[PDB]
Short mmCIF file of C-alpha atoms and ligand atoms in Angstrom, two decimals:
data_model
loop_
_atom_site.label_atom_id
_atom_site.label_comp_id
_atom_site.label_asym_id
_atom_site.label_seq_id
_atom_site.Cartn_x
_atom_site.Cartn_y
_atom_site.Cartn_z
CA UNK A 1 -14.98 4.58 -7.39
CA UNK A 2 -11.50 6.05 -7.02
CA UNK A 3 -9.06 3.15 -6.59
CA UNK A 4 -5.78 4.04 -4.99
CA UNK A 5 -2.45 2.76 -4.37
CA UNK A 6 -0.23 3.31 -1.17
CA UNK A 7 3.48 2.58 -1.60
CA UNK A 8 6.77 3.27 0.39
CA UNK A 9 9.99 2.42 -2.07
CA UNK A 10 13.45 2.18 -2.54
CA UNK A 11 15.18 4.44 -5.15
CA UNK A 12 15.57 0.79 -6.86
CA UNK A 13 12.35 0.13 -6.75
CA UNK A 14 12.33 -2.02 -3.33
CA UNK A 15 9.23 -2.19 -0.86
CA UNK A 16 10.51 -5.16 1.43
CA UNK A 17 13.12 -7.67 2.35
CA UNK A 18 11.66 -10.38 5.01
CA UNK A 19 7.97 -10.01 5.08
CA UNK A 20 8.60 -6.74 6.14
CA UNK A 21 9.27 -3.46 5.30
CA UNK A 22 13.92 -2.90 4.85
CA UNK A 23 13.55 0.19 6.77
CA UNK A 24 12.02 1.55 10.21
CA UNK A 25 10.32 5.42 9.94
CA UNK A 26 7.46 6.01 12.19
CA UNK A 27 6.96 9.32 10.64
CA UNK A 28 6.27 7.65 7.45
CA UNK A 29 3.55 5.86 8.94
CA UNK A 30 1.88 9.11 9.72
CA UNK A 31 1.30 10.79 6.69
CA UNK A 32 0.24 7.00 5.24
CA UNK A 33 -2.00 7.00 8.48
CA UNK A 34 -3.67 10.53 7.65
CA UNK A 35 -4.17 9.67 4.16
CA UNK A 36 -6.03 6.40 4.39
CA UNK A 37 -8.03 7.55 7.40
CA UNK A 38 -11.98 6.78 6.92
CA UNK A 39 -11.08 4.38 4.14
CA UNK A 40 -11.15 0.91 3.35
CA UNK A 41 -7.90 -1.00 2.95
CA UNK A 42 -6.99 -3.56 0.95
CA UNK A 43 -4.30 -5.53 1.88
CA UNK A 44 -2.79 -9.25 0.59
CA UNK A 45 -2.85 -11.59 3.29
CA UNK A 46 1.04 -11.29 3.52
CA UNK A 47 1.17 -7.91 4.00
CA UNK A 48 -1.21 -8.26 6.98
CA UNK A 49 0.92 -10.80 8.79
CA UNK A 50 3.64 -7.95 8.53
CA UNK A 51 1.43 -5.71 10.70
CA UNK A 52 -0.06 -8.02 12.76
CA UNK A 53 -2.88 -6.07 13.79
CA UNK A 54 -5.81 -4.32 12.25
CA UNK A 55 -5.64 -0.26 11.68
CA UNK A 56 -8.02 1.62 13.51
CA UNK A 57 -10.57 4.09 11.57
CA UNK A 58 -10.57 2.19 7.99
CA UNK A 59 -12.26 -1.14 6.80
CA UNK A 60 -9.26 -3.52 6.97
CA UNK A 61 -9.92 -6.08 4.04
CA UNK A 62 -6.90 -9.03 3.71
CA UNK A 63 -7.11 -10.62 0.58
CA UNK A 64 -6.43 -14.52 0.93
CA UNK A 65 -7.53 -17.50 -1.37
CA UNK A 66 -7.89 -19.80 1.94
CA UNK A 67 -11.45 -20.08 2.67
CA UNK A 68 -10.52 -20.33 6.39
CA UNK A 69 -8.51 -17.42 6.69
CA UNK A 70 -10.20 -15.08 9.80
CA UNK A 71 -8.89 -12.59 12.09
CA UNK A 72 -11.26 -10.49 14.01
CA UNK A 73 -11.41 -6.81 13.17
CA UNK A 74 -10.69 -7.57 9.34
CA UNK A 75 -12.84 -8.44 6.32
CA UNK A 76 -11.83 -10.85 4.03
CA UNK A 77 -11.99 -11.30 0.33
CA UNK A 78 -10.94 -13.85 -1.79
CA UNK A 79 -11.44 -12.11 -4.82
CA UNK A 80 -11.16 -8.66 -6.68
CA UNK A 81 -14.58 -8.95 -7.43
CA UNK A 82 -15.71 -10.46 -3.91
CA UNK A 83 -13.17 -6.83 -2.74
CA UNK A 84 -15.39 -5.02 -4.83
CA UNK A 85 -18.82 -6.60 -3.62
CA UNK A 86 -18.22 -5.55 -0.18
CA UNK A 87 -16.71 -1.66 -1.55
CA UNK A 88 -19.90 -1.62 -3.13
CA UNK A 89 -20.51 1.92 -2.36
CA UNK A 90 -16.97 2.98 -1.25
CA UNK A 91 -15.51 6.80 -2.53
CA UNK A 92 -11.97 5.77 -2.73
CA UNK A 93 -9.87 2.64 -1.97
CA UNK A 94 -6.71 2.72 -0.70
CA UNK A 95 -4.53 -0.82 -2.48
CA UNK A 96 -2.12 -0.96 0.52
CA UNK A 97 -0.14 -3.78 -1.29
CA UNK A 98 2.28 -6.59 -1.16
CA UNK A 99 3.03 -6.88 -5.18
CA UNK A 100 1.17 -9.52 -5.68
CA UNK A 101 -1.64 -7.15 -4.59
CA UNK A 102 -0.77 -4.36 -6.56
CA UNK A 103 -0.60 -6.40 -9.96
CA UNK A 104 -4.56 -7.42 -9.02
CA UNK A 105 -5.35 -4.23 -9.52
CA UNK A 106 -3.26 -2.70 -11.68
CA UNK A 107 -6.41 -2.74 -14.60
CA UNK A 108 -8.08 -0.73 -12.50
CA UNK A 109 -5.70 1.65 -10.91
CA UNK A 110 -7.20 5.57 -11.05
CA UNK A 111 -4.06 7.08 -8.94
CA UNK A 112 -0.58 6.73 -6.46
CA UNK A 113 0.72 7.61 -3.59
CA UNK A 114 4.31 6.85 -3.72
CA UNK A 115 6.94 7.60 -0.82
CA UNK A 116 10.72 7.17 -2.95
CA UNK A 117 13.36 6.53 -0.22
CA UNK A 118 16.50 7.98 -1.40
CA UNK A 119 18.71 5.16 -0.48
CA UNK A 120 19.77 1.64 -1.40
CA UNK A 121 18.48 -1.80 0.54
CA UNK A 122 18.77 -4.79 -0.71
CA UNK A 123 15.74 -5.98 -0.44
CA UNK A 124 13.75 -9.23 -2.65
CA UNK A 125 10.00 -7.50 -3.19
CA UNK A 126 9.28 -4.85 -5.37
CA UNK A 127 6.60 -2.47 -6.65
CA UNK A 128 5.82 -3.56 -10.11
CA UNK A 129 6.97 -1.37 -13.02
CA UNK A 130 4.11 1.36 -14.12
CA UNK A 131 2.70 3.13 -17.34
CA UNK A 132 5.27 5.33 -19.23
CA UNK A 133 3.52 7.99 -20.17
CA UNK A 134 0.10 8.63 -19.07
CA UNK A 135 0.08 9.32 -15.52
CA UNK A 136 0.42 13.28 -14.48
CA UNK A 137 1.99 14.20 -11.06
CA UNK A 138 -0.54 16.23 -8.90
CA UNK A 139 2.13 16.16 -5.70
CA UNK A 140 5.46 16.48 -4.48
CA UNK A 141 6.53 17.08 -0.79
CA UNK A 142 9.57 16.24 1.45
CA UNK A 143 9.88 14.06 4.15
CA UNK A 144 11.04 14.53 7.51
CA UNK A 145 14.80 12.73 9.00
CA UNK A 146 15.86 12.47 12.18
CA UNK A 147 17.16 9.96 14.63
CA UNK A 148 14.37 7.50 14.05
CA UNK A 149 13.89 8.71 10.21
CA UNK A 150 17.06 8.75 9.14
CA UNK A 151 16.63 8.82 5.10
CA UNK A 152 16.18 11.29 3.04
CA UNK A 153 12.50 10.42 1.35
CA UNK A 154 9.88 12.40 -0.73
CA UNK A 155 5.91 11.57 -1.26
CA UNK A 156 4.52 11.89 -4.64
CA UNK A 157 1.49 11.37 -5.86
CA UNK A 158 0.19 10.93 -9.58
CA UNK A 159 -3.08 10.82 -11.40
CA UNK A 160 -4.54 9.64 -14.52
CA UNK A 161 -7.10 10.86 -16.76
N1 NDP B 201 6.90 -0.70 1.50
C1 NDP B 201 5.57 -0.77 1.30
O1 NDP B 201 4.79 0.34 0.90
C2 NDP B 201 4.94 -2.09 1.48
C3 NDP B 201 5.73 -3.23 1.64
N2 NDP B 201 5.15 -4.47 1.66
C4 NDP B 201 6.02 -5.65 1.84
O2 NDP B 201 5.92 -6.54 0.75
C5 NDP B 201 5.87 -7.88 1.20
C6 NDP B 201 4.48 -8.46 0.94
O3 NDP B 201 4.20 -8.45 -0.44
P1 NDP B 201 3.99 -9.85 -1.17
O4 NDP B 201 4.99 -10.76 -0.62
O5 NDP B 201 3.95 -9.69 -2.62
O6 NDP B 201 2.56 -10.36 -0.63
P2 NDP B 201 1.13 -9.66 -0.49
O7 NDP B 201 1.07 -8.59 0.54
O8 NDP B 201 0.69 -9.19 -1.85
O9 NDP B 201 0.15 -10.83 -0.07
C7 NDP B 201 0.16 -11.97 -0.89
C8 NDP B 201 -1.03 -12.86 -0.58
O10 NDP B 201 -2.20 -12.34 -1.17
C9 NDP B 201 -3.06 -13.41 -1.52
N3 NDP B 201 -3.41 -13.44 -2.95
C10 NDP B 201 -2.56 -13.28 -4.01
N4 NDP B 201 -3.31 -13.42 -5.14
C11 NDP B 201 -4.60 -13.66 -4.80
C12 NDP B 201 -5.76 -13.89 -5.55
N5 NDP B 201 -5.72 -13.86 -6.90
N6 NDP B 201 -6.96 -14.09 -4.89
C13 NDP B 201 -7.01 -14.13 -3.51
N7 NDP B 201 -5.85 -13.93 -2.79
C14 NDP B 201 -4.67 -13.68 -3.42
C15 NDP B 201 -2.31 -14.70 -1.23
O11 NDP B 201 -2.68 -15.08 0.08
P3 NDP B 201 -2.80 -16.64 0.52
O12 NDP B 201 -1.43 -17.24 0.31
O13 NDP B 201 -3.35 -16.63 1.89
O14 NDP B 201 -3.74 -17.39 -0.38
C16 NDP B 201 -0.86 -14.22 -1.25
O15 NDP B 201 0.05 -15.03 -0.54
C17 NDP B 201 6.21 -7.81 2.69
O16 NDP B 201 7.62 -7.79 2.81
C18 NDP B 201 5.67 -6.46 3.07
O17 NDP B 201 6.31 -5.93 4.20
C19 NDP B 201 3.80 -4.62 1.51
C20 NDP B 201 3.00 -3.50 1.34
C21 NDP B 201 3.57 -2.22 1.32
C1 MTX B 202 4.49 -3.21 7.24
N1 MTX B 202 3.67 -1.99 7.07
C2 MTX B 202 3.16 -1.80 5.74
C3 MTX B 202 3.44 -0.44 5.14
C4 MTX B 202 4.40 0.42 5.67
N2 MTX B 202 4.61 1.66 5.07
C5 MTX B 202 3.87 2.00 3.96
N3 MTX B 202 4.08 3.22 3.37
C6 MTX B 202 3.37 3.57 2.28
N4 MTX B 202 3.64 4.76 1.79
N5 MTX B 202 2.41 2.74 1.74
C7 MTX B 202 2.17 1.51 2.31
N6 MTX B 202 1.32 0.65 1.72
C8 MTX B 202 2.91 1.14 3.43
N7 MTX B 202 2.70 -0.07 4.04
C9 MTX B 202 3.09 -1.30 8.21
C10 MTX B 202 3.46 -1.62 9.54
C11 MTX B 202 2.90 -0.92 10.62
C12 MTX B 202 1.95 0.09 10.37
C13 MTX B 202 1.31 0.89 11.47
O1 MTX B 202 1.18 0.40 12.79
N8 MTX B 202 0.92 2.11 11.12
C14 MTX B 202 -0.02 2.86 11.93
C15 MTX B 202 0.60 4.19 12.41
C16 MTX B 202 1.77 3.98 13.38
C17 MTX B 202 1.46 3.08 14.57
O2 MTX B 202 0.27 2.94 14.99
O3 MTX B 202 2.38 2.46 15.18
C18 MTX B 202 -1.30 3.07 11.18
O4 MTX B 202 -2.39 2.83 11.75
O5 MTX B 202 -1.30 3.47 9.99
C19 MTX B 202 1.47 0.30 9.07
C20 MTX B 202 2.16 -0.27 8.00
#
């Protein structure tokens, strides 16, 4: 299958400060929510607890090495491989992060979806560093500001062959 990644960052690099995202844009949510829609998920346990909920129309999967680890409306994997057992016949899969998410599955990464927030937090997790060379853009598009999106941000997204 197609395995995708889903990021919002800083212009350093940043994609959050607490355990949760350095930055409030509903409209970013939007265009992540259209995207992933009637797709599976894939999310590191942390990055669930940052949204507290599961996201209606895709197959919410939290990956979490506690065997215990349950929270109805999700799947759970403990595993890349146990992730890909139950995508077994998936299309695409959307890698919605946390970093330590990303660099699982960074080997088998086919293309990104990459917001860049024109701006400076100073936040303490980041989107690991990616292949010079290879990847060829496919996408660019502006973002929307306003009270309540107040940034200046651009999605992007890249593909390799
Ligand atoms: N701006 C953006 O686009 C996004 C921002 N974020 C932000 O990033 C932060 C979260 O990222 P990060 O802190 O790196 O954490 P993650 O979201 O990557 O979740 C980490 C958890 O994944 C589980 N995990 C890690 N490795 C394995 C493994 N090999 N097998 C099974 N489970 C594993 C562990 O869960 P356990 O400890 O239960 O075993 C670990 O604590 C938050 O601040 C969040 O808001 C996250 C996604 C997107
Ligand atoms: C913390 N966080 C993770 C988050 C935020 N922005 C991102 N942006 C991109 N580009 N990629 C991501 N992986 C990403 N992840 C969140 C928090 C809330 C919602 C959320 O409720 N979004 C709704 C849409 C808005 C809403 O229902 O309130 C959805 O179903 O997608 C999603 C992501």
């Amino acid at each position: 299958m197609i395995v995708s990644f889903m990021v919002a960052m800083d212009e350093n690099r940043v994609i959050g400060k607490d355990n949760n995202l350095p930055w409030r844009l509903p409209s970013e949510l939007q265009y992540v929510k259209k995207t992933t829609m009637g797709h599976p998920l894939i999310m590191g346990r942390k990055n669930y607890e940052a949204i507290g909920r599961p996201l209606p129309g895709r197959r919410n999967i939290i990956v979490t090495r506690n065997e215990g680890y349950h929270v109805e409306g999700c799947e759970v994997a403990h595993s890349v491989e146990e992730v890909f057992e139950l995508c077994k016949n998936e299309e695409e899969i959307f890698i919605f992060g946390g970093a330590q998410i990303y660099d699982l599955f960074l080997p088998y990464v086919d293309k990104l979806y990459i917001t860049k927030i024109h701006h400076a937090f100073e936040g303490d997790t980041f989107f690991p560093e990616m292949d010079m060379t290879n990847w060829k853009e496919v996408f660019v598009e502006k973002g929307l500001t306003d009270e309540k999106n107040p940034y200046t941000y651009y999605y992007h997204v890249y593909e390799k062959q």
